[PDB]
From a paper:
Dynein binds dynactin in the presence of coiled‐coil cargo adaptors, such as BICD2, BICDR1, and Hook3 to form a highly processive motor complex (McKenney et al, 2014; Schlager et al, 2014a). The pointed end is important for binding dynein‐dynactin cargo adaptors (Zhang et al, 2011; Yeh et al, 2012; Urnavicius et al, 2015; Gama et al, 2017; Qiu et al, 2018; Urnavicius et al, 2018).
We attempted to collect more dynactin data to improve the resolution of the docked conformation. Although this only resulted in a modest improvement in resolution, our new map enabled us to better distinguish the coiled coils and interaction interface. We fit our dynactin structure into the map to examine the residues on the pointed end contacted by the p150. This shows that CC1A/B in p150 interacts with distinct set of residues, which overlap with the sites used by cargo adaptors. CC1A interacts with site 3 and site 4, whereas CC1B covers site 2. This overlap suggests when the p150 arm is bound to the pointed end, all three adaptors (BICD2, BICDR1, and Hook3) will be sterically prevented from binding to dynactin.
Author numbering:
A (entry chain I): 189 to 376
B (entry chain Y): 2 to 88, 106 to 182, 219 to 464
C (entry chain J): 12 to 390
D (entry chain V): 1 to 179
The structure:
Amino acid sequence: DVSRFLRLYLRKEGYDFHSSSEFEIVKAIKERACYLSINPQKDETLETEKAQYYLPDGSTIEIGPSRFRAPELLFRPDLIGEESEGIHEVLVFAIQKSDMDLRRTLFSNIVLSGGSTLFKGFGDRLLSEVKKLAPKDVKIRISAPQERLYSTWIGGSILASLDTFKKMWVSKKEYEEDGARSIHRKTF
Amino acid sequence: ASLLQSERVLYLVQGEKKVRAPLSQLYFCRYCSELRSLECVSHEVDSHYCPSCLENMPSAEAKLKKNRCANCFDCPGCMHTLSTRATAYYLACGFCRWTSRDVGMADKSVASGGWQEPDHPHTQRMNKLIEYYQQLAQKEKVERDRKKLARRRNYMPLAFSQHTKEIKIEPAQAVDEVEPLPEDYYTRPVNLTEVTTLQQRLLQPDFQPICASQLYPRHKHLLIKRSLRCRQCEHNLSKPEFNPTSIKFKIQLVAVNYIPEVRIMSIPNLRYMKESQVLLTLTNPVENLTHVTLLECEEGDPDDTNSTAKVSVPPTELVLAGKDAAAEYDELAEPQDFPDDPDVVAFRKANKVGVFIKVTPQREEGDVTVCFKLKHDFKNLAAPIRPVEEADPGAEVSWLTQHVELSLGP
Amino acid sequence: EKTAVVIDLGEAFTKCGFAGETGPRCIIPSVIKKAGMPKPIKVVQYNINTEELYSYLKEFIHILYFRHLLVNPRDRRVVVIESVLCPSHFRETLTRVLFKYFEVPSVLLAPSHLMALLTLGINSAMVLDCGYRESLVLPIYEGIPVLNCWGALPLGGKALHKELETQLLEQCTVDTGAAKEQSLPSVMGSIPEGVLEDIKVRTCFVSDLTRGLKIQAAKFNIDGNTERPSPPPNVDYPLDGEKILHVLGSIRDSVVEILFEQDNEEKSVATLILDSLMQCPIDTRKQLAENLVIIGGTSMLPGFLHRLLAEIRYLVEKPKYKKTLGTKTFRIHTPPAKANCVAWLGGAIFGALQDILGSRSVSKEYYNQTGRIPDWCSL
Amino acid sequence: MELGELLYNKSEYIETASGNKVSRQSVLCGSQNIVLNGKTIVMNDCIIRGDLANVRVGRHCVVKSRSVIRPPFKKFSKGVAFFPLHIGDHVFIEEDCVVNAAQIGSYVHVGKNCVIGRRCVLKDCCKILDNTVLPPETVVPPFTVFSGCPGLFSGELPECTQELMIDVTKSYYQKFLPL
Ligand SMILES: Nc1ncnc2c1ncn2[C@@H]1O[C@H](COP(=O)(O)OP(=O)(O)O)[C@@H](O)[C@H]1O
Ligand SMILES: Nc1ncnc2c1ncn2[C@@H]1O[C@H](COP(=O)(O)OP(=O)(O)O)[C@@H](O)[C@H]1O
Ligand SMILES: [Zn+2]
Ligand SMILES: [Zn+2]
Ligand SMILES: [Zn+2]
């Protein structure tokens, strides 16, 4: 969705990426150059450098203000007009929904996973946006690993290696006899 | 203007926006001391007139008639003013032989009064929509006013008194299936004469018709009489109330009618070296001037400069006699004979002085361009004086520098 | 108060006139004839230096306010119609020209799609805008444009003009008038845009879905022996007087098909409505589908509205759109003014509302103070 | 060339009388009805026919070579006759130009090889560009430029035409001398 919204803002800068192939280079532009400002309103008033990005053909494009106000839509999806909570909100709401005793320990242990946390100054913004929503004088540690993109797989690789995994999985003969539920019931 | 290439040697304007324009196009501002361009100055609207039947129409009548002449018509096929021909009248063009009979408009008994353009097909639906939105906009105004005076009051919506005819337009019905392209278009020769081009289609925008027989002749477009007003200065120039069949200005003001105009009388060789003779005529009756300055070093936008013009000459006092003079009537001593200046000054006729500039061509490949500054004693007369009652010595003392850019043929 | 002027700066043509009128007073090609230049430069050009764009717009607005319209710019307000996602620097420049140079009282930057909706009177409707550069669609639901569910493809005038030029150069048959009665190919390296536009309008038309679907497979030649319908007769078009270009019948009904061609991606002018409508909220589906609006001069092409509405109902049955948009009744609105001048007419209807105009519109006193035009991007 | 008017040396053969210079090469069939009050120039191979005319020309009028000034015939139901044309003061007709115009205004610059139509009125301080066709019974306002095969409003002239055009025609006359 951030890649889709960046394409719209790039057309508002005057660079069209209409083709499905041309959507892939918008994802590359996003991954290369898009920084999350701590205050979005101050960076908008400030005149941008307009940092040049080089395309596959060789042509240059000056991204400018589209760079920072594209990934902002994660933290504030109402701006474009998508009815959602937001990345700062879903984290806090998930902790607040859980029992009162655990809230402090769950705030004290937050782990960032996936590729859409690697945005430059994501941890800086999230910490600030969580703090104001979360209760006052509570310790908030957002422990990002160095391998966020490949964290999900490494977990499976460790889980798979354990002898307990031998019990957890569903055998081919089990699926034929037990039925369809076999996969669902053994999931957890 | 065009015969002699006025679009060669240009004068510079001072302010926010710097522009290089011919002196013929520029205007001198008398309120202050700074010549300004047609671009820099603000434009106004004085009078409307028809280019065929020259009739000065008022501003109010134009708004009703949609900036058009009732009597005159322009042909739709080609863009030219039509003419009434009799047999009992039909409208015909001179350039193309398009008639009013071709499209099938009936001949009128009366000459001008009979002819008319059909009413717009969606004019009734228009007024109904305006009145609906007008009533609906009025509700928003009252809501916005009530909200604003409540904020201004700052009473926190305190209920002192009790709070709280309709116009309903029917929305357009959506057709289930739009009319298909007629089966004629398949297997039929297309004559390009019968169908109309885009240009002549778009001149009639209210119902732009594909066929020529539908395309009616539109009324002739009224033209404008421009009046210029500056940012700092108030008035500048304007036109009479009878601009139709008149070449008179109510207030004549132009850069050529105050600042001394420079012209390249002779053009020498363009092969790396030469000596060019340029004239410096005065327009004012009695004044003084000097082309001393060499446009400094990398100041006053000398980027166009592709040569080193010396013009190492002191001031020369020239005067204009507004009268039909004979060939060498009288020889003045102090003006002409005393500054002989045979190397510098080429010739000195009435309101004329030729000057030799030592240019250095072929510094670039080609297109030789020279920057030089010209000074003149501007009798501004800014202070109140009736037929030069005041001395105007401080005014005459004022030296106005115009950064000229002469461009040699090359 | 005075009747506020309406301007609508487009790549091909600009609409101009006064508020509370049946249609626009002047409609002309958006170009300027500068001294030295043989072909006149286009006034709206995206991705250039601001100073060069400022001079072109200053030159153009001057021609509109004096030669075409006859009225003082400072006296009365402006209603600038411009499409949604119009480049930032261009809109910033256009306002800066009107506010600084001309010193207009107040400009109102209306989106073309929301203005097109007012002309009908209906509060909610889907709006397709087949223009010169890009054919854009934007669902408008009860006054609120839904930017979330936008859609655009480069299948407008420019893409059609380029396709015509390519086809004519392949099957090039001109009678120069110099022993050129015999078919002479590519005597001129390029054809000027003014000619191509006139050929498109007069000669070329939009085919029926049944005939068009055969034309697509015919030129493909997908394991079939001459499976094309019978074309129309060849039309002879004059080029620069003496040179007579014989336009092939195939070119007339094949040039248009690039708009309605699937091209594997499943991205046509037809698909763009259904692609947008499927992405819209579940409650809004049935209201938007029932109220379709087709503006833009590209849709004026003869038999475009029938082909589109037909191509829609065919693409509905396709398995992708069959689930969501299966049992939906697609009905087109017929606007009061012509397809080209629907956008303009909205701004005039809006301009007639003096009370709301002054409030919504950005005053010069605000712009001189701030120097920040409000946009749908963050403030 | 760069504002300054250039030298043009005339031959011995030319009819110089009371300031008015008329090339002997240029026939003017009908010398009775045609009249040249001022210091006019008519270049070689030019035509000024007396087909029931009254061709009055300006103070400093100029007509370049291979150019024709013929009066138009008025298609009147009462009587069909040739309408007498009146060339204004300080009029500059360019080379190879065709003129079938009735009442040409003062201080005008008619371009090269440009055909002006039948019964065509031109008001003072106008300019017709080169390779242009003004159709029959057309009017051109002051401070205007008409061009194209249609012959329609192209733009406006410089404000200072009245003062400027005087210099042009008088300079050309003064500069145009015998060899
Ligand atoms: N270095 C990066 N900076 C910013 N965004 C990135 C970066 N790397 C990946 N992304 C974004 O994250 C996505 C990768 O998501 P991923 O972590 O693979 O998801 P999943 O956990 O479902 O496998 C990319 O498509 C891109 O949009
Ligand atoms: N009346 C018409 N009939 C057929 N085609 C037209 C007509 N008017 C315009 N067109 C074509 O459609 C295009 C419409 O573009 P337009 O909507 O005026 O520009 P923009 O999208 O920049 O506002 C033109 O470029 C032209 O090729
Ligand atoms: Zn001034
Ligand atoms: Zn008239
Ligand atoms: Zn005509």
